[PDB]
Amino acid sequence: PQITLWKRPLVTIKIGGQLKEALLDTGADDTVIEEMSLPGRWKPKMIGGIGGFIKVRQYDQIIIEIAGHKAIGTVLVGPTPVNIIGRNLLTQIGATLNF
Amino acid sequence: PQITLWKRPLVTIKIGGQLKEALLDTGADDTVIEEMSLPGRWKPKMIGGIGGFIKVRQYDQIIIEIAGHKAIGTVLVGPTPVNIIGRNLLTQIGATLNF
Ligand SMILES: COc1ccc(S(=O)(=O)N(CC(C)C)C[C@@H](O)[C@H](Cc2ccccc2)NC(=O)O[C@@H]2C[C@@H]3CO[C@@H]4O[C@H]2C[C@H]34)cc1
Ligand SMILES: [Cl-]
Ligand SMILES: [Cl-]
Numbered sequence: 001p002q003i004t005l006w007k008r009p010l011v012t013i014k015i016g017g018q019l020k021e022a023l024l025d026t027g028a029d030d031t032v033i034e035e036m037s038l039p040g041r042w043k044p045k046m047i048g049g050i051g052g053f054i055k056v057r058q059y060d061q062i063i064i065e066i067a068g069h070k071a072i073g074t075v076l077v078g079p080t081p082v083n084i085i086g087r088n089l090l091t092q093i094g095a096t097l098n099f
Numbered sequence: 100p101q102i103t104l105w106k107r108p109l110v111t112i113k114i115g116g117q118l119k120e121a122l123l124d125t126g127a128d129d130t131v132i133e134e135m136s137l138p139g140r141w142k143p144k145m146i147g148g149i150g151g152f153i154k155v156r157q158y159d160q161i162i163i164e165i166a167g168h169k170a171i172g173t174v175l176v177g178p179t180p181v182n183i184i185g186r187n188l189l190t191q192i193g194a195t196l197n198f
């Protein structure tokens with residue numbers, strides 16, 4: 001699709017068999033999701049947002065569908081105000097910015 | 100142009116007679132610039148994201164040139180760690196996300 005930006009670019013994602021809403025976020029290097037259960041081991045990560053640095057849990061090689069497109073990659077879990085799909089997964093679905 | 104997302108989508112902007120580097124950010128409703136002077140009236144605002152809230156000054160009807168494309172709108176000024184071009188101005192330059 002071609003997504004205009006008059007409204008937030010919200011999509012449905014599927015992760016762990018569950019549907020969630022998330023924002024397509026070119027300003028995010030990484031994908032950050034609200035608290036949820038994921039399989040496997042996690043690693044620590046500090047990320048810096050507009051209001052400072054939070055701790056998240058980094059899970060690698062997670063199956064995730066984004067607007068019907070299949071991806072497999074890193075998901076950060078923690079106290080984000082919105083689920084954000086960052087560049088690590090936007091690249092996997094072939095997303096570009098155009099003007 | 101077509102901008103891939105392997106790296107941060109940074110562009111040069113012209114704002115208030117100054118050149119800055121800013122991120123084309125589909126996850127930002129609003130445009131947020133590091134401390135600078137702008138002309139005209141402003142009012143305070145609180146904006147939130149990862150890490151919490153920051154206080155900014157809201158300037159309306161500010162002309163910005165974004166990668167060569169002129170656009171007018173509201174600009175928030177304050178202690179952002181990165182200059183962000185949000186949806187309020189991305190729409191005006193005709194930016195879309197495509198996959
Ligand atoms: C009302 O207007 C606005 C304008 C902007 C913002 S916001 O900046 O909070 N934000 C909103 C998102 C909903 C979180 C845009 C986002 O695209 C930031 C932009 C941004 C980049 C870098 C520093 C501060 C802000 N990205 C970022 O949080 O990415 C993570 C934070 C860091 C950065 O790269 C990774 O991506 C994830 C996890 C890591 C809030 C209100
Ligand atoms: Cl505006
Ligand atoms: Cl349009």
Ligand code: NA
Nearest residue numbers: 139140159160
């Ligand atoms: Na003004």
